[PDB]
């Protein structure tokens, strides 16, 4: 139900499995060998992306799950200028 | 240490990736940390700078798949006593390996292959058909 | 539909709940997904303690404050209660 | 001065003396020489003040200009305003073309330019012959000017005088030892070029001077050229030659009867039957040394007739008009061959007549044969495909069934003709590149009309597969108009022109069926034009969101489902949401938007102008480029 | 095909039909509250219809519709079909 996302800089992020399956690359990582079927950790080790971009993509996962289809009230995603151009490559890697 | 296009040596990363995909195709136990590291290596090789090693990676994967399918072909051809049992076991293993490898090669399929060539799982299935059951068509059908 | 970014050193959990609810089930679900004894949950909002029976809407965050696009941090230091040692996210590189 | 140049041009346009005296004096020498040696640009065309003096008949002003000053006649200017407007001509050329003898004689008397050669090396004798004034030609001949100056395509003055009512010029040429056997670019020895005009006296003069008979570049004797133009008098005169022989006489009479059957100006079916009867009677008159017909196999376009090898069947079909028309078409095709320029136009006229009487199937057969012949001849069939789209739209507007193989054939022909249109556009640098681009745009529009018609016609699975194959073949060339519009953009754009004929009743753009068919056939849905607008950028700009909302809804879904980006930007950095300019289109797009983190991150990168060169994967540099 | 197994707990057989074609009329306001047992089914179909048929709003008729009833408080006797 809950999967674990570990950044390169030691940081650990835990989000719901349905929330983290909206990105194709994490879905591929969870599938295949090493599923680690404890139904609680499913921990994936991201050896490249830093901690802040992983926090932002987890926030994006929750944001997209909440607003996958709603009314016109869709609030904008608060992307800082410093976190851009590093979240773009992160979304390219994750196929978000 | 970052998602930056960098000058990466093809030999070492391809050797590591070849070992991991051999373990995956043979359905042997592979560490999932190494599996995520091979996603990282796939991403690094797909958009490496200044040489976008996507054609090289695709050709090397095709060569490895051809070699693996030919080795299984030789084994199942010399095991004519239970060619069907061996073919069933090897088909289960190769189908699971092809699915898991298409999972591993998702970035290559979505960023170089389609956007023509064939997908890595599709290429694995095509190589299995063209070098595993096409030469063994007569024996498999008749037995 | 409140959204919380629970922090504990490096571990981070993204959780969805309601505005008018107790933190009892919040402690229970983080106990379930953390595999720890249920007596060490001491939630901290802006480095201060809060009541275990008071609703989390009045605890310091609400729908207008806590959003899926930008959840509010909640420290979850466990009793060995330990001091709040929430590791900050890695700073982005200095853009030109 | 440009203003002074305009002032002296207006002064010479009125043919005054004191105005030009005041406007060309009290100054230095260099500016005056520049003024008298420059052209003024009026109406987009450049002409000398001497040109406007000679054109309006004001020869007194140019005579006083030659008396007072030393103005030259070697100024470079245009030729005429009658659809030619090519430069390089001298002042004496247009002076001869103006039809005024006095200005020509005063220009000759001081600095004669009788031997002037333009870019087409056309002497003022060409303009004198075109105007038809005998005195100017006589003076030019007496001024020691060569009359054998042939053009790059060999347009001798005798031929260009023979093309119009200037038999006096041709005569004055031919009793001065003119060319008796000079060919041309198309091999016309002035007799192919004179019989089309039909001036019987000119042909009389040429026969009297023994102009002889020889086939042109298309393998046509001048007798056959006269027979093709439905002109009986020149046919008779060329027949009275004592060397034509019975075979050519019979085939010339038969071709004349054939041409009389299908022609706009000269249409007489009774003359058609009578000339065919005269040709047949001269064939079957002896029984010995007979001249049997080289009967071609029957062609499905002209029904299934097999000519008329007996007078009995010709008498049987005497009162049957459509059989006479098809017989004339068949024998005309046999005589003129299948690779002639003029063999296709009577077929087109017969098809138009058949379509006026709502006989659409035979019209389609005839026009398909004409299209096949013209494509074998490698000529511009942009007007013919428009006619096909018009007659197919009229069948739909009349609720008449349309044959799917006919649609497949015309679509394949349109695809091929668009291919040679692209080849012609690439090959031609600046000769007729505007006409080539107009033909290219017209061909793309006609292909769209044919596709829209094909979507509205019930077709079998194999026929639909063939139509989709032709569409796929055209899409893989990626055709683009002047403003970068791909074939998907025009089917999306509401500004795509529709022909004023029956295509308005069927081909209405935007059309969801055309867009869906193109996307199923593999259209580049993310392709942008020169301005950068994608296929989604133009559909949101539609100004009729509710009148045809069923069309607008069915096309936005198709583009997004095909894979068009709902967030990409043009060269002006405008999201289709921003360029939606309509609440309904914005609502539909926002309903069909599939949000992603990559689009948001790229939009944030582009908004903050972050330096993204060489910091991102090369497959993502384009992603930042349009997001 | 959803990412998670949606616990419908219901058999759903809606008859979706056009607005301007059918002569059905909701001129009275007819204020009605959907009960909680079928509250999940009505919400999932709104997500399904808006995903496959964009730009279509769905007003629900509450008088020309029926179905079986789950009477847990009644001891579940004699399963009935009511509006």
Swiss-Prot record, chain A:
Intracellular or extracellular location(s): Nucleus
Keyword entries, A-Z: Host-virus interaction, Nucleus, Transcription, Transcription regulation, Ubl conjugation, Ubl conjugation pathway
SMART domains, A to Z: Skp1
Pfam families in the cross-refs: Skp1_POZ
PTM comment text: Ubiquitinated by the DCX(AMBRA1) complex, leading to its degradation by the proteasome.
GO molecular function: protein-macromolecule adaptor activity; transcription corepressor binding
InterPro entries according to UniProt: ELC1, SKP1-like, SKP1/BTB/POZ_sf, Skp1_comp_POZ
Pathway: Protein modification; protein ubiquitination
Superkingdom of the organism of origin: Eukaryota
GO cellular component: Cul2-RING ubiquitin ligase complex; Cul5-RING ubiquitin ligase complex; cytosol; elongin complex; nucleoplasm
Tissues in which the protein is found: Overexpressed in prostate cancer cell line PC-3 and breast cancer cell line SK-BR-3.
GO-annotated biological processes: protein ubiquitination; regulation of transcription by RNA polymerase II; target-directed miRNA degradation; transcription initiation at RNA polymerase II promoter; ubiquitin-dependent protein catabolic process
Subunit note: Heterotrimer of an A (ELOA, ELOA2 or ELOA3P), ELOB and ELOC subunit. The elongin BC complex interacts with EPOP; leading to recruit the elongin BC complex to Polycomb group (PcG) target genes, thereby restricting excessive activity of the PRC2/EED-EZH2 complex. (Microbial infection) Interacts with HIV-1 Vif; forming an active cullin-5-RING E3 ubiquitin-protein ligase complex (ECS complex).
Family: Belongs to the SKP1 family.
Protein name: Elongin-C
Record organism: Homo sapiens
Curated annotation (Swiss-Prot), chain B:
Disulfide bond entries: none
Post-translational modification: Neddylated; which enhances the ubiquitination activity of ECS (Elongin BC-CUL2/5-SOCS-box protein) E3 ubiquitin-protein ligase complexes. Neddylation leads to structural rearrangment in the complex that allows interaction between the E2 ubiquitin-conjugating enzyme and the acceptor ubiquitin. CBC(VHL) complex formation seems to promote neddylation. Deneddylated via its interaction with the COP9 signalosome (CSN) complex.
Stretches that traverse the bilayer: none
Cell compartment(s), UniProt: Nucleus
Notes on the domains: The Cullin neddylation domain restrains the RING domain of RBX1 in the E3 ubiquitin-protein ligase complex; this restraint is removed upon neddylation of the cullin.
Family: Belongs to the cullin family.
Function comment: Core component of multiple cullin-RING-based ECS (ElonginB/C-CUL2/5-SOCS-box protein) E3 ubiquitin-protein ligase complexes, which mediate the ubiquitination of target proteins. CUL2 serves as a rigid scaffold in the complex and may contribute to catalysis through positioning of the substrate and the E2 ubiquitin-conjugating enzyme. The E3 ubiquitin-protein ligase activity of the complex is dependent on the neddylation of the cullin subunit and is inhibited by the association of the deneddylated cullin subunit with TIP120A/CAND1.
The protein's name in its UniProt record: Cullin-2
Source species: Homo sapiens
Protein's gene: CUL2
Residues of the full protein shown: 2 to 162 of 745
Swiss-Prot record, chain C:
GO molecular function, one term: ubiquitin protein ligase binding
GO terms classed as biological process: positive regulation of proteasomal ubiquitin-dependent protein catabolic process; protein ubiquitination; protein-containing complex assembly; target-directed miRNA degradation; transcription elongation by RNA polymerase II; transcription initiation at RNA polymerase II promoter
GO cellular component: Cul2-RING ubiquitin ligase complex; Cul5-RING ubiquitin ligase complex; cytosol; elongin complex; nucleoplasm; VCB complex
Domain Ubiquitin-like positions: 1-65
Functional pathway: Protein modification; protein ubiquitination
Top-level taxon: Eukaryota
Keywords: Acetylation, Host-virus interaction, Nucleus, Phosphoprotein, Transcription, Transcription regulation, Ubl conjugation pathway
Compartments (UniProt record): Nucleus
Location, primary (coarse class): nucleus
Coiled-coil regions listed in the entry: none
Family: Belongs to the Elongin B family.
Subunit comment: Heterotrimer of an A (ELOA, ELOA2 or ELOA3P), ELOB and ELOC subunit. The elongin BC complex interacts with EPOP; leading to recruit the elongin BC complex to Polycomb group (PcG) target genes, thereby restricting excessive activity of the PRC2/EED-EZH2 complex. (Microbial infection) Following infection by HIV-1 virus, component of a cullin-5-RING E3 ubiquitin-protein ligase complex (ECS complex) hijacked by the HIV-1 Vif protein.
Protein name: Elongin-B
Source organism per UniProt: Homo sapiens (Human)
Part of the full-length chain shown: 2 to 100 of 118
UniProtKB/Swiss-Prot annotation, chain D:
Residues at the site labelled Cleavage: 342-343
Disulfide bond is among the record's keywords: no
Tissue specificity of this protein: Widely expressed. Highly expressed in testis. Weakly expressed in other tissues.
Record-level GO cellular component terms: Cul2-RING ubiquitin ligase complex; cytoplasm; cytosol; mitochondrion; nucleoplasm; nucleus; ubiquitin ligase complex
Keyword presence, Metal-binding: yes
Subcellular location: Cytoplasm; Nucleus
Xref: SMART domains: ANK (SM00248)
Keywords: ANK repeat, Apoptosis, Cytoplasm, Metal-binding, Nucleus, Repeat, TPR repeat, Ubl conjugation pathway, Zinc
Pfam families given in the database record: Ank, Ank_2
Substitution effect: residue 130 to A: Abolished binding to -Gly-Leu-Asp-Arg C-degron at the C-terminus
Binding site for Zn(2+) 2: 186, 218
Biological processes, Gene Ontology terms: apoptotic process; branching involved in prostate gland morphogenesis; epithelial cell maturation involved in prostate gland development; proteasome-mediated ubiquitin-dependent protein catabolic process; protein ubiquitination; regulation of DNA damage checkpoint; regulation of extrinsic apoptotic signaling pathway via death domain receptors; regulation of ubiquitin-protein transferase activity
Binding-site residues for Zn(2+) 1, renumbered to this chain: 185
Leader sequence residues: none
Regulation: Activity of the CRL2(FEM1B) complex toward FNIP1 is inhibited by BEX family proteins (BEX1, BEX2, BEX3, BEX4 and/or BEX5) in absence of reductive stress. Mechanistically, BEX proteins act as pseudosubstrate inhibitors that associate with FEM1B via zinc in absence of reductive stress, thereby preventing association between FEM1B and FNIP1.
GO MF entry, a single one: death receptor binding
TPR repeat segments: 344-377
Family that this chain belongs to: Belongs to the fem-1 family.
């Amino acid at each position: 139900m809950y999967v674990k996302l570990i950044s390169s800089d030691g940081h650990e992020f835990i989000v719901k499995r349905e929330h983290a399956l909206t990105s194709g690359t994490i879905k591929a990582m969870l599938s295949g060998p090493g599923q680690f079927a404890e139904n609680e950790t499913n921990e994936v080790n991201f050896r490249e992306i830093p901690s802040h971009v992983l926090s932002k993509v987890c926030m994006y996962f929750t944001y997209k799950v909440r607003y996958t289809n709603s009314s016109t009230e869709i609030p904008e995603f608060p992307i800082a200028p410093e976190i851009a151009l590093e979240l773009l490559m992160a979304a390219n890697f994750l196929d978000c | 240490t970052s998602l930056k296009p960098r000058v990466v040596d093809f030999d070492e990363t391809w050797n590591k990736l070849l070992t991991t995909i051999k373990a995956v195709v043979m359905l042997e136990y592979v560490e999932r940390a190494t599996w995520n590291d091979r996603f990282s290596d796939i991403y690094a090789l797909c958009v490496a700078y200044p040489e976008p090693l996507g054609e090289r990676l695709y050709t090397e994967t095709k060569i490895f798949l051809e070699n693996h399918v030919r080795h299984l072909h030789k084994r199942v051809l010399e095991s004519e006593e239970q060619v069907l049992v061996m073919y069933h076991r090897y088909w289960e293993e190769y189908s699971k390996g092809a699915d898991y490898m298409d999972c591993l090669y998702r970035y290559l399929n979505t960023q170089f292959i389609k956007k023509p060539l064939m997908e890595i799982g599709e290429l694995a299935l095509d190589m299995w058909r063209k070098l595993m059951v096409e030469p063994l068509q007569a024996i498999l059908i008749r037995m | 539909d409140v959204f919380l970014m629970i922090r504990r050193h490096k571990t981070t959990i993204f959780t969805d709940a309601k505005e008018s609810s107790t933190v009892f089930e919040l402690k229970r679900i983080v106990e379930g997904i953390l595999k720890r004894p249920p007596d060490e949950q001491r939630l901290y909002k802006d480095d201060q303690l809060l009541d275990d029976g008071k609703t989390l809407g009045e605890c310091g965050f609400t729908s207008q404050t806590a959003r899926p696009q930008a959840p509010a941090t909640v420290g979850l230091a466990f009793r060995a209660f330990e001091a709040l040692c929430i590791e900050p996210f890695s700073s982005p590189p200095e853009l030109p | 001065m440009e203003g002074l140049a305009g002032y002296v041009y207006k002064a010479a346009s009125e043919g005054k003396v004191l105005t030009l005296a005041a406007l060309l004096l009290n100054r230095s020498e260099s500016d005056i020489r520049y003024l008298l040696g420059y052209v003024s640009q009026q109406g987009g065309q450049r002409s000398t003040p001497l040109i406007i003096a000679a054109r309006n008949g004001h020869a007194k002003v140019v005579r006083l200009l030659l008396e007072h000053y030393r103005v030259q006649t070697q100024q470079t200017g245009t030729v005429r305003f009658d659809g030619y407007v090519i430069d390089g001509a001298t002042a004496l050329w247009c002076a001869a073309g103006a039809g005024h003898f006095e200005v020509v004689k005063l220009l000759v008397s001081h600095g004669a330019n009788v031997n002037h050669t333009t870019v087409t090396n056309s002497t003022p004798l060409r303009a004198a012959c075109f105007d038809g004034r005998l005195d100017i030609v006589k003076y030019l001949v007496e001024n020691n000017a060569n009359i054998s100056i042939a053009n790059k395509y060999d347009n001798t003055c005798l031929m260009i005088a023979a093309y119009k009512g200037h038999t006096d010029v041709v005569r004055y040429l031919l009793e001065q030892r003119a060319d008796p056997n000079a060919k041309a670019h198309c091999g016309a020895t002035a007799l192919h070029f004179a019989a089309e005009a039909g001036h019987i006296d000119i042909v009389k003069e040429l026969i009297k001077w023994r102009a002889a008979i020889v086939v042109n570049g298309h393998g046509m004797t001048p007798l056959k050229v006269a027979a093709e133009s439905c002109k009986a008098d020149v046919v008779e005169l060329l027949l009275s030659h004592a060397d034509c022989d019975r075979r050519s006489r019979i085939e010339a009479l038969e071709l004349l009867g054939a041409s009389f059957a299908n022609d706009r100006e000269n249409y007489d079916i009774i003359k058609t039957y009578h000339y065919l009867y005269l040709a047949m009677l001269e064939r079957f008159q002896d029984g010995d040394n007979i001249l049997e017909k080289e009967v071609l196999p029957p062609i499905h376009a002209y029904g299934n007739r097999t000519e008329c090898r007996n007078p009995q069947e010709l008498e049987s079909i005497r009162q049957d008009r459509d059989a006479l028309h098809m017989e004339g078409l068949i024998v005309r095709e046999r005589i003129l061959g299948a690779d002639n320029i003029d063999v296709s136009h009577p077929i087109i006229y017969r098809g138009a007549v058949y379509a006026d009487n709502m006989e659409f199937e035979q019209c389609i057969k005839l026009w398909l044969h004409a299209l096949h012949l013209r494509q074998k001849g490698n000529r511009n069939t942009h007007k013919d495909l428009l006619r096909f789209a018009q007659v197919f739209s009229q069948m739909i507007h009349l609720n008449e069934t349309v044959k799917a193989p006919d649609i497949e054939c015309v679509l394949r022909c349109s695809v091929l003709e668009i291919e040679q249109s692209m080849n012609r556009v690439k090959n031609i640098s600046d000769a007729d590149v505007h006409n080539a681009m107009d033909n290219y745009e017209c061909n793309l529009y006609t292909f769209l009309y044919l596709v829209c018609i094909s979507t509205k016609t019930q077709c079998s699975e194999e026929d639909q597969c063939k139509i989709n194959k032709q569409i796929y073949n055209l899409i893989h060339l990626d055709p683009r108009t002047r403003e970068g519009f791909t074939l998907l953009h025009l089917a999306v754009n509401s500004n795509t022109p529709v022909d004023d004929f029956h295509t308005n009743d069927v081909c209405s753009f935007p059309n969801a069926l055309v867009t869906k068919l193109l996307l199923d056939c593999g259209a580049e849905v993310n392709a942008v034009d020169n301005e950068g607008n994608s296929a989604l950028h133009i559909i949101v700009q539609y100004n009729r969101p509710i009148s045809d909302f069923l069309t607008l809804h069915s096309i936005i879904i198709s583009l997004v489902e095909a894979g068009a980006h709902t967030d990409m930007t043009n060269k002006q950095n405008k999201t289709p949401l921003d360029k939606s300019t309509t609440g309904v289109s914005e609502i539909l797009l926002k309903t069909q938007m599939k949000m992603s983190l990559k689009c948001l991150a790229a939009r944030a990168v582009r908004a903050n102008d972050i330096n993204y060169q060489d910091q991102i994967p090369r497959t993502l540099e384009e992603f930042v480029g349009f997001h | 095909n959803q990412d998670t197994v949606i616990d419908l707990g219901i058999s759903f057989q809606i008859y979706v039909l056009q607005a301007g074609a059918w002569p059905l009329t909701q001129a009275p306001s007819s204020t009605f509250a959907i009960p909680q047992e079928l509250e999940k089914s009505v919400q999932m179909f709104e997500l399904f219809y808006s995903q496959h048929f964009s730009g279509r709003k769905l007003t629900w008729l509450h008088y020309l519709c029926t179905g079986e009833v789950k009477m847990n408080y009644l001891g579940k006797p004699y399963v009935a079909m009511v509006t």
